[PDB]
Design a binder for this molecule. Sequence first.
Ligand code: ANP
Lengths: 602, 181, 159, 221, 208
Amino acid sequence: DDDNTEIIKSFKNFILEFRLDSQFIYRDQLRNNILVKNYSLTVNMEHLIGYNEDIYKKLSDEPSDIIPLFETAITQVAKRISILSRNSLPTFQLILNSNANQIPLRDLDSEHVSKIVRLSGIIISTSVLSSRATYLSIMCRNCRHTTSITINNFTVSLPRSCNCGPDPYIIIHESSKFIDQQFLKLQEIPELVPVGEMPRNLTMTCDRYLTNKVIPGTRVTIVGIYSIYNSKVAIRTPYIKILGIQSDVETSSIWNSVTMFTEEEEEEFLQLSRNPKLYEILTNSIAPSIFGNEDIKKAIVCLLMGGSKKILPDGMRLRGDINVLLLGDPGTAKSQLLKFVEKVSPIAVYTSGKGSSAAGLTASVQRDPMTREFYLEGGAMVLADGGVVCIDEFDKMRDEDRVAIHEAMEQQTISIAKAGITTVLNSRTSVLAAANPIYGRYDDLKSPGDNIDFQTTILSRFDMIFIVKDDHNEERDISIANHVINIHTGNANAMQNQQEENGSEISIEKMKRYITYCRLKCAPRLSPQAAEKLSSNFVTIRKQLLINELESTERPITIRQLEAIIRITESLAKLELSPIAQERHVDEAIRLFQASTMDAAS
Amino acid sequence: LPAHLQQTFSPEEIQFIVENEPIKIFPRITWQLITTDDKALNNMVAMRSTEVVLWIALLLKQQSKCSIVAPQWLTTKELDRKIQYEKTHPDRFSELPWNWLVLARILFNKAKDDFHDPIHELRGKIQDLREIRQIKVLKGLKYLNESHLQLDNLSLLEINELRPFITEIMDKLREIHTASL
Amino acid sequence: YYDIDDVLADGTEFPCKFQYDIPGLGYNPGRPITKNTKLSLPLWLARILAIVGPVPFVELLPPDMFSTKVMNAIKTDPVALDLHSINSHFFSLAIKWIMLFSEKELANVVSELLLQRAQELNHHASSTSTFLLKLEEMEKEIYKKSHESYKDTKRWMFK
Amino acid sequence: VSPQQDFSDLMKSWKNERCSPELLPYPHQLMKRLLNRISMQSQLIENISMGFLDMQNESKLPLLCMETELERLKFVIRSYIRCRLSKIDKFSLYLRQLNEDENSLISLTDLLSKDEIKYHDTHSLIWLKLVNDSILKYMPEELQAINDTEGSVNMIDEPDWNKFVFIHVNGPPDGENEFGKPCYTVTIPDLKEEVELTIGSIYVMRYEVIRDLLRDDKVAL
Amino acid sequence: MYGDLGNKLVLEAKRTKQLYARSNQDVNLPMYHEDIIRNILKEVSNLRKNTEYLKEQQQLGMLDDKVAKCQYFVTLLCMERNKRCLLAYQRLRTDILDSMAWNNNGLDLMSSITFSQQDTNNLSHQEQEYLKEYCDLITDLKSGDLVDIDLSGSLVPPSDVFIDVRVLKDAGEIQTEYGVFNLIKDSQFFVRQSDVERLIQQGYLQKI
Ligand SMILES: Nc1ncnc2c1ncn2[C@@H]1O[C@H](COP(=O)(O)OP(=O)(O)NP(=O)(O)O)[C@@H](O)[C@H]1O
């Protein structure tokens, strides 16, 4: 251990001595974080390999036996930094990341066990916070000898030495110190390497300042260490202890959230607002794939920003942002489109169901068959809260909680009174309906309504409803057909978009950060007269659709339709980053739903 | 209208202040220059100790026709006596040349060659010195009250960099306090 | 005054009932309002309404933010309480009420509020997390001049 | 009269200037000899510079050293003056509030440079043009004045002698006001008692209580 | 409903203080709100319209009623209120612009405020006239010194003494002054601090 103490000196050396010209980065970082009460430091393994190779060669060999030692010195480092003596100072956390070298999950077996592995995968579900020991002490049940154990990481049962026997010790719970542990359940990336099979989930565990760092269902990178423990031959459960974890780009986001700030954003986000093309250049962000369909193309944008959400007392609150329908003949690009749309969302879930992929479209509470006691299992809508709703096959959605969609879209909630739990839980999720209409183009010579299940009311529940009609028509094709062979090889259209990147167009991983950005600032609002304009526009929309109904035609319009078009205003306005909205500003939102009014006229 | 800073001096500026202090050098050279605030000199003896202002020495060191002496205060074994005094005096800040942090960066940028083993040594000692001194500062900051302040020995860089925080705050203190009557 | 926050600080309504009947209602068709009708009023008008009547025009009940509730609430763990949630203009204000109404104790308390606050606020000198959200505007700006001082200082410190 | 004391007190004036609470007298008695002195060798240097073209059919070191000396010294007075011009604007009304009054010490030739008084009233005047043609039309009668009402307030501000600033104490001692224990000085604060002081000790407090000591040159800032 | 209308405006004044504060500094003031202040103005004229009317009414049937005495002590306050709001709005709106003057003209050879301060039309004409008149005034500070100053120039301390500046898509050369340094795209130099100060603010020069 004095060998380990020489290693201790080696790391104290490592910190005090190291230089990037000229400040000692970790050293600054310490006194920086001690007032953060971070009590942790993120160290490049490359500044380490650059400092002394030796210590890594032995670190990479049995890091488990060293990582705590590495901390016992830097926790001492704070002692020689934080304050001078001649409290209480918590035992440090360390989080180390490195560029390293990526390894795929399916190939992880034996071998590399008990070493470092950088890798990504994606988390499925977060385990509840579980607190674990840091310090504990004990008096003897018989001789009353006072023991003090420092419980360190990374099982180990309590030592019995002062009948006395066999092991007469019970924890002094009053004086003990503690830490949280996460128990990540995380899954391999969707792309590799499923081969034919199902995606694996390998279990890992956070602690301290690592906890709650990562959302359920977001792409992430963990480094950690591959290890095993029994957990009822020898057949012990595979797992990875976690150091250090870093979000895949960004992800940051959560919570409240982040910028941070990198000032060039405000300017670059304001210049966007000074670009008259910005609304439309967002439209040109959405489909490098899809040439044309500019209408619905303008329709996607306004959703993601979030629309008006105003909470006015009493508890009455109106939703945002809205709903959209991609229903139309196959060839619409709407699934390809949607597979753009979800990748655009900062946080969302792609549902072609039924519900996705295996998800109860609404959270279905299911008993833990072990230790009984129903617990809510989460849901696609639930996890997608404050994010996009993706729906295919909406012709086929679960009929019982189809209504929970009929509800959650509107009341921004789902009430579960089932079993024990009565909690009404938030889905503020904004739906985009991509289903294929009954019989394709055959509902066009028929009543276009009742197309969606057996009721027209679903349309009212939705907002921006759009029927995409592609006739086989000339030259609108020959140009997109021309667009095609370019799109494929050699991405002759995907190069042509990179000079529009330099000339005009957005990068769209940017578009995430844009829509994340302007959704966290307070809700935009129209001046009075555009609203009264919504009044004389709609009095004629409604007038028109009673007069249209002079033929006794069954149908379509509501008073949530006018309001629907309202939210589109604050959407398109939230583009502007402006607390107000101009008359014409609102007006192209009007022309934007105006096609849906003729969808009512067809 | 300066806008910035404005009351406090920019570190960028305060360096321009200290750059006006006297120091000794070891000339390579043997008109006048006339100048203004210089006085000296007649052709100045090469390879001998001589007193000049800093910035001139900076520039001629940039032509390497001079060599700047390490201040006799700046040495390893010396920093030890001072930092030790610092640990055994939890309240007082001990004693310093006062333009020093600036002097440190200034010399290390160029004058680096003239010292014997400043490298990987003093920058650490002064990082730590500035450290324990910084905690002595920050810990002294709980006595902050109107209207009295003893910062005693504290460097102009040290002070100015934190100037807005005590100044601006203390006004919010005194104002309200006497305002009570 | 010519700092936006000065006209902005009087933009706060205080509970006040008038000691007199006031024909020519300041707000709609009283036209007078009977004596002791409770009303929230901006300080810019109210401030003098005590100074002139020797009985004043207005009674001026204690504000909701100075309640024993809040006054000891801050006394418990000053760092944690969110000042942005309360007004947010407080030190920019409480100073005004402590002038106008001329109290002596709450001062000695409040000063300590700002003190502890600053004890923490300095600790952010080094280059948030939840904290940055919850600061008062002057408590937000002290951060500007303080921090930016350092933010320049380090950038000088190296190249 | 020492050319070095000129710049010593030039920095004294400058350093005191930006840190200062409010505008203080314009040191023309010494600056004058300066603003001439600058042009003296500003002209001289070019004679020996173009005179260096006379050897052209070696030592440029003191050449550009001397050149440098100028811009380095010329920049000095810039922040000094500009800061004053700002504080003038900031105080433009109060300057007139002291100006129209008889007592005690006024702008005159005494506080402001000639360019400073010119800039002062030309600025406040054109300010009046801009404020009058735009928001005073539109100018109800009691509102016709831009000044004290009274309350609140306005500018007035900022004769704040109360403000806090960092200082460093010095004087060419009798060893006057020196009471010990090692060193001077008093005097006691408005609402409190004496501290007191030593030159080696930097003591931060109200600008009022210490102001005389700036006037006395008994303390650096 | 009363003196509130100005509070929207001073709030906007807060945000526009923030647009210069960090900021980062591009200045570009949003606009003079001509409409809203005039709403205020129709009520500020309305207020003294009511008050002048009451000044008639106090003389007849009110008979210096202790309450009739109030509204002069009352409505006039909102007059001061508006005044405060408008004043400080404009003192902001001007201090920012005077700052926008000092920094750049701008600098040689300013040689004009034309196209400088891109707001142009957007900045209200009373302020346009004012501002350009004010830098007309600052030109007289270029008259007073006789330094030479270069108050607009030489903001930051010198060092040392020679730097390498690179030109960005700039020609050039305007270099008739002193000597002709032949500005070309992608052209850098090694030169003293002196000549830098003008084309570094003129945008032509870059690297320090
Ligand atoms: N701009 C485009 N417009 C139309 N088709 C396109 C476009 N770009 C690519 N395509 C191709 O045509 C298809 C567009 O999708 P589409 O045929 O409408 O199926 P879908 O309707 O999106 N899936 P579904 O929701 O089940 O009906 C893709 O498979 C592409 O190969």
